[PDB]
Amino acid sequence: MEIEARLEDVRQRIADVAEKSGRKAADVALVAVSKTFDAEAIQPVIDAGQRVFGENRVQEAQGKWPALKEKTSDIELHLIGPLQSNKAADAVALFDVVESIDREKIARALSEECARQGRSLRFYVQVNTGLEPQKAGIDPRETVAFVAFCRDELKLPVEGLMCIPPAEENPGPHFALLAKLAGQCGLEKLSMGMSGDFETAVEFGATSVRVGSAIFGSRAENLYFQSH
């Protein structure tokens, strides 16, 4: 019963900040990040009512989600980690949403595979909001132009923008910049806010937050839970 309690608390926390910010809890999607957790640990979350999940790696996802999806028909799986061009095919075959379009090469790859597989997924363009040399993502200054490229030239539908700000600084400006860019791109969806800042993210307009440990517990905790 720990999972149900944790999930309800997360949803309640989302609702509290949403309402405080003048928004509806319904406006914020909760993506349960299941990275590092096996199918056995994930099922309890699905049983608790969760349908939207996120995985950082295609390979890890391939090993556990197929069985989970044939068991539960309405799963919405998001790829929230970097994608190598040689895994694009596998990703298009398994995921419903790919939030990591961080460069031209992968946008093209995703575009061709959707075509080759007769599929139409949902996509987010990842922005390197702080322009950190060590981080992936489109330059904020080239984002508007990049989204036009995806939508017009690659005929790749783009749902919104996504970011993962540097952990050692205030998320505020990063979220605010992403919101601004989204408006300039004519996009209404924003994937920002993770484990330690999803509440602040909602305050800046986040429409989708990625929460992992708060739902599953840490690796140690979760396994402790699944003893009885």
Ligand SMILES: [Pr+3]
């Ligand atoms: Pr309850």
